[PDB]
Design an enzyme around this catalytic site. Structure first.
Site, PDB file in Angstrom:
ATOM      1  N   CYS A  32      13.840-108.894   1.880  1.00  0.00           N
ATOM      2  CA  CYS A  32      13.473-107.579   2.397  1.00  0.00           C
ATOM      3  C   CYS A  32      13.208-107.632   3.898  1.00  0.00           C
ATOM      4  CB  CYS A  32      12.248-107.037   1.663  1.00  0.00           C
ATOM      5  SG  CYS A  32      11.923-105.270   1.969  1.00  0.00           S
ATOM      6  N   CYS A  35      10.341-104.955   5.095  1.00  0.00           N
ATOM      7  CA  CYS A  35       9.078-105.427   4.541  1.00  0.00           C
ATOM      8  C   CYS A  35       8.358-106.338   5.531  1.00  0.00           C
ATOM      9  CB  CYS A  35       9.315-106.176   3.228  1.00  0.00           C
ATOM     10  SG  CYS A  35       9.901-105.125   1.859  1.00  0.00           S
TER      11      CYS A  35
END
Length: 107
Positions: A32, A35
């Site tokens: 990710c 993230c």
């Protein structure tokens, strides 16, 4: 100072320690990108709130918690209060939207 939950039982355990404190968490993954963009600002806030508990849940390890919350996407922002979700946010957000959202729920 934040606690990474690598299990479905740990999430519950960490929540028990949260008590009446507001728990803002994030669902991420090793793959990710966005993230990782919140990691720096998420951790900083935890030190600037001195009241709420900021923890890190990786869906790669916490693959049993997500299905229980029906999360579908990352970076997901989850807000817990008294063992119950009092807010659910999806996708990344700036430092002001996170803090504003928190301050709006932290009481």
């Amino acid at each position: 100072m934040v606690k990474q939950i690598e299990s479905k039982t740990a999430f519950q355990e960490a929540l028990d320690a949260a008590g009446d404190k507001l728990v803002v968490v994030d669902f991420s993954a090793t793959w990710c990108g966005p993230c990782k963009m919140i990691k720096p600002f998420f951790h900083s806030l935890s030190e600037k709130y001195s009241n709420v508990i900021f923890l890190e849940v990786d869906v790669d390890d916490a693959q049993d918690v997500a299905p229980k919350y029906g999360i579908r996407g990352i970076p997901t922002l989850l807000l817990f209060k008294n063992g119950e979700v009092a807010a659910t946010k999806v996708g990344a957000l700036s430092k002001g939207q996170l803090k504003e959202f928190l301050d709006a729920n932290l009481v």
